[PDB]
Amino acid sequence: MLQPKRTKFRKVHKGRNTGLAHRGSTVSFGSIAIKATERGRMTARQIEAARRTISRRIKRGGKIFIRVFPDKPITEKPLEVRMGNGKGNVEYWVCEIKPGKILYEIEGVNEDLAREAFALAAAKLPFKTTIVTRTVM
Amino acid sequence: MKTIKVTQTKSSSHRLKNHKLCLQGLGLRRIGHTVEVQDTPSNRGMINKVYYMVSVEE
Amino acid sequence: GSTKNGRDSNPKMLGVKVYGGQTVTAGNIIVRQRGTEFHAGANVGMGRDHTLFATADGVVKFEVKGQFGRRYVKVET
């Protein structure tokens, strides 16, 4: 599970997820890529599982570029505990996802095999996705 | 001086305070009441601020 | 358990008191600031706590001047 090596603060506010991903929506490290189309959260375990699924089916014959990092800590209260007495304890890390954000790029693999790998990976994610290819403009 | 007619077409019970004051400053006191007002930017400002509940005849 | 946080200081009410275009008399405080966010110009005095005040009757004005880009506040008689 990817996690930051160090951080300034252990716990962060909940916040809100709105708007679009104007940055990071372009293919820059490969020819074919998978792109989210609805907003949500993506966890470290989901990142690893999708990466494993893609790598297995591509047979480790090309490069996989991961452009999502779970930098946001999330807390949870113990269990059988009443409200109050301070914020809960960090339990896992996530990455906020806005529509149009690219998740995985594939380089050096046949287009059909890459599309099939992305189709396998999409079954593990909690949001809709599509496939995009590099374009001049 | 050119002039215009303003008619109130909705209730002001639950509107905002400044919108109520705009109606009062125009002189509209109830639904259906029609008032005659000089056409100046000062009055047009209140009319535009309360456009959604008034009708203007020019 | 128990949280080890839960403390804060009382408010201080810092900020600007007189804006540009306003008339002031000698002694009126114009800006309350922890540091030198604004610098005194003509007819404006600086206190030990960096408070800016008027030293003459007139009208307040704000400007940007100098090589450092320092913001200045002055009074025009």
Partner: protein
Amino acid sequence: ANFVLNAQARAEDKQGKGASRRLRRESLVPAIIYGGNAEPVAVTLELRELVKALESNVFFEEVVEIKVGDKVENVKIQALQRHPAKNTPMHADFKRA
């Protein structure tokens, strides 16, 4: 010669966020043409025709003629704004050639 895009004048009343959204609903893409010796010109192009041009690779490295009325403007594609999610074109810049 290969790329001849039809266009229409886009006046002031057709500019702004609301007018742009109305045009895109009507299936039109606003675009701007700028270059030396002449002032900027705002035009509106058809989405189908722009997409068909986009599929071609040479369209990015060749000159193209935009026709509005009897006027003809010879230009080259400079910028292309795309919807981050759907990827549909939304706006275009054209440098006079």
